[PDB]
Design a protein around this ligand. Structure first.
Ligand SMILES: [Mg+2]
Ligand SMILES: [Mg+2]
Ligand SMILES: [Mg+2]
Length: 48
RNA sequence: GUUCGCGAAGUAACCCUUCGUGGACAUUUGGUCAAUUUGAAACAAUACAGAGAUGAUCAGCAGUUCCCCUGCAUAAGGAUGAACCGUUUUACAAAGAGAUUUA
């Protein structure tokens, strides 16, 4: 319990940020391979 | 349209009427702006969650910003208002030791 406790220094807010940011990156990757597979159909859809 | 005056005609007896003409009086509004889709309100609803300092549950003041919102406000609130929490290499040298090349 303690040996696990010491190792995280931040507090709820920072961790919350780590998540939010990664979720943004999943959004990016997804939207990309959206556009990639649409290029494999040749139809070119512009990014927002 | 008024008035002054002239001329003409008629009525007349110096006038009443009609015609013509001269003169004066009176003298430049408004527009940054066309009448609903295509020159710009903002909320709400759906889904996703669902409140900083900590191991945890709360009071809070601040600080910076090419973010502001409510408020008459130089008051005070808006999660202590929100954003901050991340990515990170060179004024660069001196001494010593081994390998390589050359005068
Ligand atoms: Mg305040
Ligand atoms: Mg609080
Ligand atoms: Mg504040």
């Amino acid at each position: 319990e303690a040996r696990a406790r010491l190792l995280n220094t931040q507090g709820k807010k920072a961790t919350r940020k780590i998540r939010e940011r990664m979720l943004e990156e999943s959004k990016r990757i997804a939207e990309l391979q959206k556009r990639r597979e649409l290029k494999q159909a040749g139809i070119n859809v512009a990014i927002k």
